[model samples]
Target: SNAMFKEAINNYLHTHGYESIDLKAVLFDMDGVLFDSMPNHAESWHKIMKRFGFGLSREEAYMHEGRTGASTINIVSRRERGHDATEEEIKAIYQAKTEEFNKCPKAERMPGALEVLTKIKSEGLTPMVVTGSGLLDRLNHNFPGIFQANLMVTAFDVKYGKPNPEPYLMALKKGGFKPNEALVIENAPLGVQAGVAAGIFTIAVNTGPLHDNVLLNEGANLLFHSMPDFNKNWETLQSALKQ
Candidate 1:
């Protein structure tokens, strides 16, 4: 399977103008991939949407992961109210969602997240974060001294979010890396699209309610059932990639 996966990457490289893979960095998506925070995020969105006289099912919120708060609010507002949310409305709704998320129990690091990062570090690869979440404060608290402050791209770092290439592109720019020099690990379809659009090999780890096809259709180079599953295969996968 690792060999097959490597074959896919090799084919991708040929088609995408890369001479060969030189993965110096591994870019991570934060919420579902690193932190098991999707449930809280879904609950928060569901609650706030209802409170604001809008309707967004919790399951649908998982699909909207990797979008900026304003972008998510605007999508719903456009559908329900026939207009984009005004700045004030966006501010209020996002603040409410954040408050609701905070009210929910704190999220722990996703299982096997640390092991993946540790292995990446031990292999001398830079582990970089490219997330649409503004909650960068959680990094040091939950995974202290693991992430380098300089190599991160957060919501505030870009004007466009997932489904847009800005966030991942910014990460590449910040790390001075070419697309072939990094790989992406994402759990959301939109994030996968963003990573692929940036011309990087994207791996989708389904850790939520969305169908596997949803991620596969977004052009993920590889798909794993969960973070731990990814960790289980990391050594073999990395070895294959490096070949």
Candidate 2:
């Protein structure tokens, strides 16, 4: 218990120090933060589960929101079926699920996402996308010009997934941004964890299942219901930063 408490205290200390960081660039998570694709992802997984005679609810899907497809499949299949999934099983399921998800053909941008990205660009701050999606697929499908900034890092590019600092670190290094000069915008626990581990200011958007308190507890420097809410509070944020 003391060890856990000590760890908590250490984490709080780290997060407190991060509050004063001034950001010159912003790193964005693609799926839930920029595009409203969680629903599609959930629907796709649900179909995959049914084929295996397993059931997955939307709430269950929420738990996997910020995870990579392979990771999500492993977790859900193991939990629901009471067995560890093999690599082939994982690949087949993910392929089927992604195929179904892609059938949607179009996913709308998140609320105020376009505005915030445009603002970041016009303000001369660099924008980078750090996502679990395949780089080419993300470029070709989601937002072509969105990742036009200095760097783009994806799960496929890194050896480790979210909750690991590798992907975010790669993005930061590629973008040529110092840890204190970058702000990470994320909507999931793992994404925020990676950002915090990388010593970046992590702004958590409660666009998915997790609550604001949960996000903040995970070391989010800022929390908002959506990008629009963040935009509305930008002046306050800027003022605080100036102080």
Candidate 3:
């Protein structure tokens, strides 16, 4: 553990009205954070928009990360067609997008992702997934039995999604962890905003094409380049909390 991490932890604890950091459950945002599938998702959205003669681009799709499928489609509807999308339209759009995504190659695990999970588990911290994305083909397929279904918060579980705090707050309730006892790891800027709004310390991982400043702008408490970097510093983070 480096002294830098200690200082950050100390400052965070003090600012949050605590004498020490005693982190417990760690909430992770899926998609970009767990699986490198944001590219496929973006492409899928772009394809759907093109097919509908709408105006969404790949870059714009990336910016829409962490929104539920229905929400994403509805936002496009509100912008391009001037009304909230209908239930049938949302269902059809989302379903078509998912089917188009199947044509894209499968997403791989985030680099060093499993190692970070192992480190957190070894520290006796609970690992929970707070996913705004409905696509989980890679996660359930690749890491079978790795995550308990109850510890996962998916799109269907939340009435509202990021940058709303509902999803993350629900995670805390479901996982039985206080905001101060858990930290959120997210790669999407909106996901970071959701975590910060939930009053949890949030770490942004620059796993996708988005600039680091984007996540920072959403009030991420800390930023790392990727899962490999986060794993490298896990010891420092844990040590600070322990001390």
Candidate 4:
């Protein structure tokens, strides 16, 4: 959202062979980007993965933030156990994680998330959420009437999730937008990679404990330290997108 970020966007588009930027919608990743829930998720993952005899540091959970539960289980299982988790194992492990997450302190809406959403809506851009989390009710309670059911891409909507391009591709189709017609706001490396793989301009907001280079290395077009920082630069970014 600064001069450097704009330059990075142009360079990314050029390098990726994108001919133009139409920007009809702004896609968002929920967990870390919209709610301060990553801590709870990371803690849950850490506890559950350990309980199952898989080694996952709390910080390492950020790396798998946007992957579906089954994918996360399978990835860890393949690495640790040398095979994918059985369906029963996936279910039990995920259930344990959910129970652990539920026991944590309630998550608050991310500061400045509303401001960013309001700005995007004011600019007449559709703001659609694309998340790995299955809970959609929280969004309604947090953002009110800004989102529609059909425009959201959640765990229930796709067989494949972030880092695979399928989720964002589904988002594009649901929103009736081409890749160039939308941009993604994500906080996880996997989410950033998914957006890039879908050929959408992806902005990364570092809201977790990970290093900035982690997201950049995954191909984020722009990076911000937090949602408030992104909100502060939203107008600058909105103006640049027009050109």
TM-score of each: 0.96, 0.83, 0.92, 0.94
Evaluate all candidate structures by whole-model CA lDDT and list the values in order.
0.89, 0.74, 0.83, 0.88
Q: Could you tell me how far off, in angstroms, the CA of residue 96 lies in candidate 1 after the best superposition? A: 0.8
Tell me the spans in candidate 4 whose CA falls farther than 4 Å from its real position: 16-19
Which portions of model 1 miss their true places by more than 4 Å? 135-137
Error of 4 at 70 (Å): 2.0
TM-score of 4: 0.94
For residues 1-243, could you state the per-residue lDDT of candidate 2 as single tens digits? Answer: 234333443454465565444557889988888888888887888887778666777767766666676777677668777777788887887777778887994778888887777677777788888887644464445554556644888766787778788888998889888787777888887788888888786788888766677677778766788878876765555444442
What TM-score would you give candidate 2 relative to the actual structure? Answer: 0.83
lDDT per residue (tens digit) for residues 1-243 in model 1: 766877888888888987788879999999999999999999999999899888899988888889988888888989998999889888899888888888865788999999888899889999999888875467877776678879999988899999998999999999999998899999999999999999889999999999999999999999999999999989888887775
Best by lDDT: 1
Output the better candidate (1/2) by TM-score: 1
* Tens-digit lDDT track of model 4 for 1-243: 367866977896788787668779999998998899999998899999999999888877888889888988888889887999999998999899989899964699999998889888888899999998865577788888778899999988999888999999999999999898998999999999999999899999999889999999998889999999999988888778766
Worst 10 residues of 1 by lDDT: 135-144
Worst 10 residues of 4 by lDDT: 1-10
User: By lDDT, highest first, what's the ranking?
Assistant: 1, 4, 3, 2
In model 3, pairs of residues that clash are: none
Best by TM-score: 1
